[PDB]
Amino acid sequence: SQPVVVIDAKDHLLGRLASTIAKQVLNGQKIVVVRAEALNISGEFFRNKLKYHDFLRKATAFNKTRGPFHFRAPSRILYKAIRGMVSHKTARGKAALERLKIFEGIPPPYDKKKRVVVPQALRVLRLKPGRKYTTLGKLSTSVGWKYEDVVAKLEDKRKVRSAEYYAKKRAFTKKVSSASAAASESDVAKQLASFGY
Amino acid sequence: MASLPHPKIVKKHTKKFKRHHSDRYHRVAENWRKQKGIDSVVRRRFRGNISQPKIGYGSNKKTKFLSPSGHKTFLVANVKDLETLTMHTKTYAAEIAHNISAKNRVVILARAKALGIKVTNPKGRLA
Amino acid sequence: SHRKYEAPRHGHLGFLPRKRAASIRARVKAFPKDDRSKPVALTSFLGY
Amino acid sequence: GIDHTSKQHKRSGHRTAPKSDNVYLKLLVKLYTFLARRTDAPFNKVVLKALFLSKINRPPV
Amino acid sequence: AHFKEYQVIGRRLPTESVPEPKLFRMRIFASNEVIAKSRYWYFLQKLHKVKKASGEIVSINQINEAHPTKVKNFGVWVRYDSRSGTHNMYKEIRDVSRVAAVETLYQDMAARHRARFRSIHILKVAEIEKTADVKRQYVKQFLTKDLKFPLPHRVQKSTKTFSYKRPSTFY
Amino acid sequence: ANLFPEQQNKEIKAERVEDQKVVDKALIAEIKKTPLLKQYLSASFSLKNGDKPHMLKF
Amino acid sequence: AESHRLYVKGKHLSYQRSKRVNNPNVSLIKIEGVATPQDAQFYLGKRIAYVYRASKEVRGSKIRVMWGKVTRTHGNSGVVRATFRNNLPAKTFGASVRIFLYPSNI
RNA sequence: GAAAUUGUUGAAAGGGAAGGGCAUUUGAUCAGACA
RNA sequence: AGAACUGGCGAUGCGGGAUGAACCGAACGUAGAGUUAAGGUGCCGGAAUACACGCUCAUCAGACACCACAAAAGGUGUUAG
RNA sequence: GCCCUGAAAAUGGAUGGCGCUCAAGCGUGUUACCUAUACUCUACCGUCAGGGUUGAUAUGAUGCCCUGACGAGUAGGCAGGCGUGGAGGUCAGUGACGAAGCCUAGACCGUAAGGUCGGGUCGAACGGCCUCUAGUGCAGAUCUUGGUGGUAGUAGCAAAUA
RNA sequence: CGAAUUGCAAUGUCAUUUUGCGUGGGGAUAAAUCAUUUGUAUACGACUUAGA
């Protein structure tokens, strides 16, 4: 229902998120995935690394600047997964992927905004407890992504600046709750509670 | 020239049935010719390829040869041909031939305006 | 079919795009690491 | 989609009118169709289906 | 399937030499009378000299359960044909009804041995009466005193695709 | 004729208004026997964001 | 006061189709809030409009409308079918149509 | 005084072809006006 | 390489098997509405991230018969007997 | 029963792809749902068959009307038709107030072959109907003749002292 | 106080970028290419140089 949808990709599964996206962004929703470095993917790290190396093996022999462009960052990994779910060789798919913006970390326009969660992609709900999973940051860093130590220095900063906001808002919230609780016994409110409100 | 007993003229396949590879080659005209080949695809009616004429596309017998005005067309070259339509005014429309002189077109038009007949090419050779 | 007699490659595939450089002044794609204790001093120079 | 026992669109092997263009024969047929239709006598139909016949199936007596 | 239990009486066809032949009875598990009557002639035709044509079916009656709101330990003696050889098995189940025990026996047999309905013959189903003849641990662990356990990891279903708070698995 | 010929185009009469005043005064009489209803009729219906018409009543 | 609307917004998903074949006569509509065929049966017969722009002002407006209706449901998730006077142009895949309540049964 | 082929003007389109079938939008054009 | 019976292709498009002369379904006038076949319902892709009992974690898993490959011999790895 | 080892091949690569691990995998089961030129209903065309109608109206039955069923198709057979050059009749046919021809993302008719109209150009003969007749209909034949293109403003115009 | 006669429904328009023109209010006063030249360059382009 929202015009734009900001998605925290922490503790999310890759394909199970990307299918949901690839349908919504084809149906016409502008979607902004954010904090893609903390994404998760099933199976063990060595297994996923073997699969990525099998993907790196595939390059056009006669000129390797023509072939599968192996993007090493998590945003681009997820973009690959979505683009495989989308008909990107058409205007429909190109327009659809123009409605998508993926980021590592949480930049300014989307740090002061509300983030949501796709529950049919969450690791904690889908995976059996005890199974091994994999983190996309460690994976990308293992295959040649050089900016994990930077988004970390920025995310803790964002987090400090967010926790102080929460620390202020929580006090404002208790004050408003203590101001509104002084009217709950009133006939304006025990007449509302007869309607559920 | 009211002529309002006719019912809902429908036309199956209002397109023109062009020949195969009339657009690729200038020698192959657009006039329809069946493809008698053996390794053909129009002859075998594959998917995505063009549509061929059949009698299934044939028009209703009540709305055959009618122009959308509800009339069917009769060619006249002179007044003697018009006077045949003095009864059948609400069914036949008097198209004038392509070879008549402007001197005689006005005679025909004037006679038809009196007989109530409807003409389909009355702005012809007029100036 | 295989080569009758093996021999190494000619050239180096890492000095590739064996083209003209984009500027006559070559650019330093890498500087030393910074020791955040030593005195402030230049790292390089350009001469003729 | 039907499994046909019989051949479809099978003309009856007979001729329901002459091959000739003789006006007077056509008129005789106009008469005997009327009689064969509006009469229960099978003479009329026999004569009719005989008026259609070739010169070799209509031989001389 | 959604099974049912049937009681099928059958009879080799009468003759002047023996116009009161022997009625044979079978208690069969199946989804409908049709395949029940088919299985009756499958088992009887393994033991006695008769067929459908050379025989008839007298009575066919559904057997409903007497105490379907009672938990029972159903011991089950069965035989199944594998890809290489034929074997027997005994399994205990803890369902309330004979038919339900069968329904969950066909299933876990197909799981653990990849044996289909067409391979399995259910020989005997026995309600065990006392809590001392049970010998299978996966049943005995539910025959304890003051049995209690939790469901730790809960997963709430969702009718909407976007949610605005991280879930909790607490029960 | 699309330039206001003024042949019975826009003139509201003074006969309907008595028949309008006779019913509404007898009807507001029944409305004012219950509260918050003059305001109800004065308002206008609109669907908000979370409104599911197949789920809500009238 | 801030809201004035009397319609439900929905999306033109696609045409009716098999795999590798489509029927542009029939279009598929995703309505908001709907999740089942029951509770979509309410929206049957209801009119639909696709409102778009054009540069040639005709009859005193740049906005133009293509009308249609809802005919029947789609399988298990609250999608429906629609049939317009003049079928929709396929660049509207992922565009907002508006379903009215004009033929009502409440 | 045709066509192939070509020049100028005008309209339109164009990320490693073009052309074609079904459906519709948009632009042009024609319609009949039931006058 | 040579035969028997039926069916089909050749002479035959259509839905499915990604693709395919032969497989599955089903055989064709032009159109509308409805229902289905074989096959399928995460997304590409129209259709349940539907329900239920179980097995499996594979450092080249496995995944629509014809079909596009797999044996003997071993594993307290696990499950049941 | 599942999984692993056995099980090694040559451009980079294929459960169709992404991707999936209490599956989006395997075995089995229950409903719901999608959709083929198939099935059902209706309209329309055509063919085949059966029947009614010369009461006699437009004497025509070449037809008109009702009813039911059916429609794949190479080689090949038959039928009904379109078109072309000339011939015999006929419209007391068109026409220098402009015949024929040519151009026309301008119109109409027919399932189609094709016909008809408007406009522009042009300048002297040409059509419709009933029949006759044939040197009668082209995308091809490494077809014949004539003409024309991309290649392409390209290869190249450099032996013999200047 | 008025909102009626848009006559039983027909988007019954406010969004959002770009662009031109005019009104009036201030604000700002240049480089590149060719041609010539150089040879750290060079098949031609290009590169690198110099020139009131």
UniProtKB/Swiss-Prot annotation, chain A:
Cross-link Glycyl lysine isopeptide (Lys-Gly) (interchain with G-Cter in ubiquitin) mapped to chain: K175
Alphabetical list of SUPFAM superfamilies matching this protein: Ribosomal protein L13
Pfam families: Ribosomal_L13
Annotated GO MF terms: mRNA binding; RNA binding; structural constituent of ribosome
Free-text description of this protein's post-translational modifications in UniProt: N-terminally acetylated by acetyltransferase NatA.
Biological process terms in GO annotation: cytoplasmic translation; maturation of LSU-rRNA; negative regulation of translation
Locations listed in the record: Cytoplasm
Any one GO CC term of the record: nucleolus
The keyword Phosphoprotein appears for this protein: yes
UniProt subunit comment: Component of the large ribosomal subunit (LSU). Mature yeast ribosomes consist of a small (40S) and a large (60S) subunit. The 40S small subunit contains 1 molecule of ribosomal RNA (18S rRNA) and 33 different proteins (encoded by 57 genes). The large 60S subunit contains 3 rRNA molecules (25S, 5.8S and 5S rRNA) and 46 different proteins (encoded by 81 genes).
Purpose of the protein: Component of the ribosome, a large ribonucleoprotein complex responsible for the synthesis of proteins in the cell. The small ribosomal subunit (SSU) binds messenger RNAs (mRNAs) and translates the encoded message by selecting cognate aminoacyl-transfer RNA (tRNA) molecules. The large subunit (LSU) contains the ribosomal catalytic site termed the peptidyl transferase center (PTC), which catalyzes the formation of peptide bonds, thereby polymerizing the amino acids delivered by tRNAs into a polypeptide chain.
HAMAP family in UniProt: Ribosomal_uL13
Cited NCBIfam families: L13_A_E
Extra facts: There are 2 genes for uL13 in yeast.
Family: Belongs to the universal ribosomal protein uL13 family.
Swiss-Prot record, chain E:
SUPFAM superfamilies, sorted: RplX-like
The keyword Manganese is assigned to this record: no
Cross-referenced InterPro entries: Ribosomal_eL20, Ribosomal_eL20_dom, Ribosomal_eL20_eukaryotes
GO biological process: cytoplasmic translation
One Pfam family, short name: Ribosomal_L18A
Alphabetic keyword roster: Cytoplasm, Isopeptide bond, Phosphoprotein, Ribonucleoprotein, Ribosomal protein, Ubl conjugation
Recorded GO CC terms: cytosol; cytosolic large ribosomal subunit
GO molecular function ontology, one term from the record: structural constituent of ribosome
Crosslink (Glycyl lysine isopeptide (Lys-Gly) (interchain with G-Cter in ubiquitin)) position: K124, K130, K148
Locations listed in the record: Cytoplasm
Keyword Cytoplasm (UniProt): yes
Signal peptide: none
Post-translational modification Phosphoserine, affected residues: S31
Domain of life: Eukaryota
Major localisation: cytoplasm
Subunit record text: Component of the large ribosomal subunit (LSU). Mature yeast ribosomes consist of a small (40S) and a large (60S) subunit. The 40S small subunit contains 1 molecule of ribosomal RNA (18S rRNA) and 33 different proteins (encoded by 57 genes). The large 60S subunit contains 3 rRNA molecules (25S, 5.8S and 5S rRNA) and 46 different proteins (encoded by 81 genes). eL20 forms multiple interactions with RNA and proteins in the central protuberance, connecting components of core functional centers that are located far apart.
Family: Belongs to the eukaryotic ribosomal protein eL20 family.
Miscellaneous comment in the UniProt entry for this protein: Present with 54300 molecules/cell in log phase SD medium. There are 2 genes for eL20 in yeast.
UniProt protein name: Large ribosomal subunit protein eL20A
Naturally occurring in which organism (per UniProt): Saccharomyces cerevisiae (strain ATCC 204508 / S288c)
UniProtKB/Swiss-Prot annotation, chain F:
Cellular-component GO terms for this entry: cytosol; cytosolic large ribosomal subunit
Keyword hit for Phosphoprotein: yes
Entry annotated with the keyword Cytoplasm: yes
GO BP, one annotated term: cytoplasmic translation
Compartments, record wording: Cytoplasm
Record keywords: Acetylation, Cytoplasm, Isopeptide bond, Phosphoprotein, Ribonucleoprotein, Ribosomal protein, Ubl conjugation
Processing after translation: N-terminally acetylated by acetyltransferase NatA.
Subunit structure: Component of the large ribosomal subunit (LSU). Mature yeast ribosomes consist of a small (40S) and a large (60S) subunit. The 40S small subunit contains 1 molecule of ribosomal RNA (18S rRNA) and 33 different proteins (encoded by 57 genes). The large 60S subunit contains 3 rRNA molecules (25S, 5.8S and 5S rRNA) and 46 different proteins (encoded by 81 genes).
UniProt miscellaneous comment: Present with 37100 molecules/cell in log phase SD medium. There are 2 genes for eL6 in yeast.
Family: Belongs to the eukaryotic ribosomal protein eL6 family.
UniProt name for this protein: Large ribosomal subunit protein eL6A
Highest classification ranks of the organism: Eukaryota, Fungi, Dikarya, Ascomycota, Saccharomycotina
Portion of the full-length sequence here: 119 to 176 of 176
Curated annotation (Swiss-Prot), chain G:
Record PTM: N-terminally acetylated by acetyltransferase NatA.
SUPFAM superfamilies reported for this sequence: Translation proteins
Main location: cytoplasm
GO molecular function: structural constituent of ribosome
Compartments where located: Cytoplasm
PROSITE patterns, per database record: RIBOSOMAL_L35AE
Gene3D superfamilies per UniProt: translation elongation factor selb, chain A, domain 4 (2.40.10.190)
Family annotation (InterPro entries): Ribosomal_eL33, Ribosomal_eL33_CS, Ribosomal_eL33_sf, Transl_B-barrel_sf
Highest taxon in the source lineage: Eukaryota
Modification sites for N-acetylalanine: A1
Gene Ontology cellular component annotations, sorted alphabetically: cytosol; cytosolic large ribosomal subunit
One BP term from GO: ribosomal large subunit biogenesis
Keyword Hydrolase in annotation: no
Assembly and interaction partners: Component of the large ribosomal subunit (LSU). Mature yeast ribosomes consist of a small (40S) and a large (60S) subunit. The 40S small subunit contains 1 molecule of ribosomal RNA (18S rRNA) and 33 different proteins (encoded by 57 genes). The large 60S subunit contains 3 rRNA molecules (25S, 5.8S and 5S rRNA) and 46 different proteins (encoded by 81 genes).
Function: Component of the ribosome, a large ribonucleoprotein complex responsible for the synthesis of proteins in the cell. The small ribosomal subunit (SSU) binds messenger RNAs (mRNAs) and translates the encoded message by selecting cognate aminoacyl-transfer RNA (tRNA) molecules. The large subunit (LSU) contains the ribosomal catalytic site termed the peptidyl transferase center (PTC), which catalyzes the formation of peptide bonds, thereby polymerizing the amino acids delivered by tRNAs into a polypeptide chain.
